[PDB]
């Protein structure tokens, strides 16, 4: 009978909160208590790029730290150049409703996705010049969240049928299907060795999956709602989630449990974006107020407040070499800081 | 230099093009549709035609006056949609449709249109209203076996508005009828009292013609109290 | 780990009276509205009741008029049903629902493809 499987479920999963209460012996914030705290932090305003006619929906750097890509709800990927403010390429969308946008490590591809469940996969440096469409992969039974490259072959996508997928390029199809999930899929991150990922999935959840064996290791738990953002920490040993309930959170996976929490009284709106800066120290964060914020990452003290944009703020990104921070909205304007 | 002047020149082109593309999209109007499966927006989507497989999104283009009009149908999708509705909150119009003839299901379609109303992304969209399948209305209230005040005990003690404008040649019990069901919705949309959007309703079957300029005269309507509130003239 | 929890139940005759009670533990309880809904034989999922924040708003579905009503205890953590005068069509699965952000008033919580705040139900019988 069911009976006997709920009563099994409800065992083990006694076992789990008794098995990891019993590792707790500090909370961070004590250990932490003997350190300088940062001061405080003024940044400012270098490049505003202008171009775009209707909302923003994703961007994303490249590995030189000059050339960035942007996807907006009117059929329209752009790259932009950030030192000059200049223009390299501008290319139309068969379809209109984009969700995602990503950038090869290589600076050979792009990728793009959204409403019409399809990936699609566009080629930059050709030989007579133009910028065609090159691959079109299809499968997925729902819209498409996010993306990320993993090398010039293979990729990795999440959409809104509750699953994860594995592709190869050239033969266009899935390679391993990560099940498991019960709601919509809204973010996913990867390890800096390209051996593990993490997937936030809208159920106060979030999971942490092997790549080349195909299956789920442990599961995280702690919000109150639906899970927006997600990003790795720079030694892949800690990763930071924001959720509906104005709250972020920092969950470590060797202890197997929530090690912070970042929170205030007069924050009632939910988070869109989280990124962490190049040593550890600063943690950034967009809201639904119109503005972002700046977070101390051991104190969890505020330290930083930016405030350009008119509409709400979706996308949020850091570079390689730590030099700028860049913002974008739904009033269509992109935002150097440095 | 030497280099500085091809970034420019590509830079300039560019802005040509962008430009272009300006002009053509400042100048469309775009719909979004919304029913369920008993309501019938697939013969209203043929009939205002002559004017692959697991896809996402479906398009219909149409001209009226030489005005054109884009309108949006969603696929294959799952049932939870409180995610993908913010995708839409910059459009002219919603369409909502609803079927009049079933005393069964009016209770979901009037909560849907309820959670439309008071949405956070969707608070400055006006919404037209088409109340579909008249005839099949008129025939079940005609012929006497099914009770409406089984389903909502108001129905008890309604008498129709003394400004009644029936078309002629009808029975009063379909004018009754017609009017409570409207009279319904029409209470949902003046709840909140802020005056910032508008509903439209109207009656339709499944012979008709005149839905394209019904549409056309509700747009019309929303452009001019836009335009007299962007360039201050109130 | 948001979990809800009923009680209450059963079969009852005819003219009947009974009441539904639901625990909830994972969250705040004060800064959300709830929701009661049901499933019949046969049939798929339908909408009974709401109730708001502080208790401002209440409201009921046509045939239920004049016969059930609803309560809510915010220090205890409780959400209340009390059912009157029971008829053979009243036969069904109950679940409560939460809806999904605070701070909010609208809902979008009877869809069957696994909604993820809801308990796993009372079933309640009327016969003779």
């Known amino acids: 009978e069911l009976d006997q499987l709920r009563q099994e479920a409800e065992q083990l999963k006694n076992q789990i909160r008794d098995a990891r209460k019993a590792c707790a012996d500090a909370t961070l914030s004590q250990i932490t208590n003997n350190i300088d705290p940062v001061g405080r932090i003024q940044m400012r305003t270098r490049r505003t790029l202008r171009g775009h006619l209707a909302k923003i929906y994703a961007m994303h750097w490249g590995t030189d730290s000059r050339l960035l890509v942007s996807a907006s709800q009117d059929g329209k990927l752009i790259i932009w150049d950030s030192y000059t403010t200049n223009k390299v390429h501008a290319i139309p969308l068969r379809s209109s409703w984009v969700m995602t946008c990503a950038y090869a490590p290589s600076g050979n591809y792009v990728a793009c996705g959204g409403l019409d469940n399809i990936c699609s996969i566009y080629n930059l440096k050709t030989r007579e010049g133009n910028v065609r469409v090159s691959r079109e992969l299809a499968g997925h039974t729902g819209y498409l969240s996010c993306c990320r490259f993993l090398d010039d072959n293979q990729i990795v996508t999440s959409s809104g049928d509750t699953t994860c997928a594995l592709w190869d390029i050239e033969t266009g199809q899935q390679t391993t299907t990560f099940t498991g999930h019960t709601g919509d899929v809204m973010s996913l991150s990867l390890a800096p060795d390209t051996r593990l990922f993490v997937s936030g999935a809208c159920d106060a959840s979030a999971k942490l999956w092997d790549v080349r064996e195909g299956m789920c290791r442990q599961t995280f738990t702690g919000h109150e709602s639906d899970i927006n953002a997600i990003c790795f920490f720079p030694n892949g040993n800690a990763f930071a989630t924001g959720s509906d309930d104005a709250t972020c959170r920092l969950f470590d996976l060797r202890a197997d449990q929530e090690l912070m929490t970042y929170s205030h009284d007069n924050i009632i709106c939910g988070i869109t974006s989280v990124s962490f800066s190049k040593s550890g120290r600063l943690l950034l964060a967009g809201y639904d107020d119109f503005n972002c914020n700046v977070w101390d990452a051991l104190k969890a003290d505020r330290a930083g407040v930016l405030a350009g944009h008119d509409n709400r703020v979706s996308c949020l990104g850091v570079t390689d070499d730590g030099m700028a921070v860049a913002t974008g909205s739904w009033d269509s304007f992109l935002k150097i800081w440095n | 230099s030497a280099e500085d002047k091809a970034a420019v020149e590509r830079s300039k082109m560019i802005e040509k093009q962008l430009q272009k593309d300006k002009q053509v999209y400042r100048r469309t109007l775009r719909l979004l549709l919304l029913g369920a499966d008993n309501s019938g927006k697939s013969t209203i989507v043929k009939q205002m035609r002559i004017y692959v497989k697991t896809s996402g999104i479906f398009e219909t283009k149409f001209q009226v006056d030489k005005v054109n009009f884009h309108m949006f149908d969603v696929g294959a999708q799952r049932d939870e949609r409180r995610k993908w509705i913010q995708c839409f909150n910059d459009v002219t119009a919603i369409i909502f449709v609803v079927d009049s003839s079933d005393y069964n299901r009016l209770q979901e379609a009037l909560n849907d249109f309820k959670s439309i109303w008071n949405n956070r992304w969707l608070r400055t969209i006006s919404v037209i209203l088409f109340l579909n399948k008249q005839d099949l209305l008129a025939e079940k209230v005609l012929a006497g076996k099914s009770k409406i005040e089984d389903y909502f005990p108001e129905f008890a003690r309604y008498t129709t508005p003394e400004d009644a404008t029936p078309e002629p040649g009808e029975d009063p019990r379909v004018t009754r009828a017609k009017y409570f069901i409207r009279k319904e919705f029409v209470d949902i949309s003046t709840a909140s009292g802020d005056g910032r959007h508008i509903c439209y309703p109207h009656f339709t079957c499944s012979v008709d013609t005149e839905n394209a300029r019904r549409i056309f005269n509700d747009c019309k309507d929303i452009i001019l109290q836009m335009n007299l509130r962007e360039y201050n003239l109130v | 780990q948001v979990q809800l929890q009923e009680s209450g139940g059963g079969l009852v005759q005819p003219g009947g009276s009974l009441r539904l009670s639901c625990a909830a533990s994972?969250?705040?309880?004060?800064?959300?509205?709830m929701n009661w809904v049901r499933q019949a034989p046969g049939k798929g999922l339908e909408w009974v009741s709401d109730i708001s924040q502080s208790g401002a708003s209440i409201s009921y579905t046509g045939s239920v008029k004049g016969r059930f009503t609803i309560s809510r205890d915010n220090a205890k953590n409780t959400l209340y049903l009390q059912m009157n005068s029971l008829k053979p069509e009243d036969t069904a699965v109950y679940y409560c629902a939460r809806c999904p952000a605070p701070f909010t008033r609208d809902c979008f919580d009877v869809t069957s493809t696994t909604y993820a705040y809801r308990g796993q139900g009372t079933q309640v019988t009327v016969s003779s």
């Open positions: 994972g969250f705040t309880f004060s800064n959300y509205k």
